Design a protein around this ligand. Structure first.
Ligand SMILES: Nc1ccc2cn[nH]c2c1
Length: 116
């Protein structure tokens, strides 16, 4: 509270580290469904069904232009990518599987990088 300051982690490397993690995502072989925004004019249903579209290139742009206030807002967007994927794709599909794989991949890197 006022004048009662919690000791707080060093966050000067967070921007660099998030960019590092995002780069590993981008270069994963199962990243292809998530590299670019879904084309809302070619994919039936998507615009109406998915209220907050998100993809790695949009996250990269936001990260590069200071649009994430902190590491958790970054993680929220990454997770949004995979939550959208689950919303629109069957688990038993190529894209569906890719999403599960990429989510697992991210969360381990997240834990390994930040939660000591
Ligand atoms: N087959 C196919 C084509 C476009 C999209 C977008 N999300 N999932 C898709 C699946």
């Amino acid at each position: 509270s006022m004048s009662v300051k919690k000791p707080k982690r060093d966050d000067s490397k967070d921007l660099a580290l998030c960019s590092m993690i995002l780069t590993e995502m981008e270069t994963h072989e199962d990243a292809w469904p998530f590299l670019l925004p879904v084309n809302l004019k070619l994919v039936p249903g998507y615009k109406k069904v998915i209220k907050k579209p998100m993809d790695f290139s949009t996250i990269r742009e936001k990260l590069s232009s200071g649009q994430y206030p902190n590491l958790e807002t970054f993680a929220l967007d990454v997770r949004l990518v995979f939550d959208n994927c689950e919303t629109f794709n069957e688990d038993d599909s190529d894209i569906g599987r890719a999403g599960h794989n990429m989510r697992k991949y991210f969360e381990k890197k997240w834990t390994d990088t930040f939660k000591v």
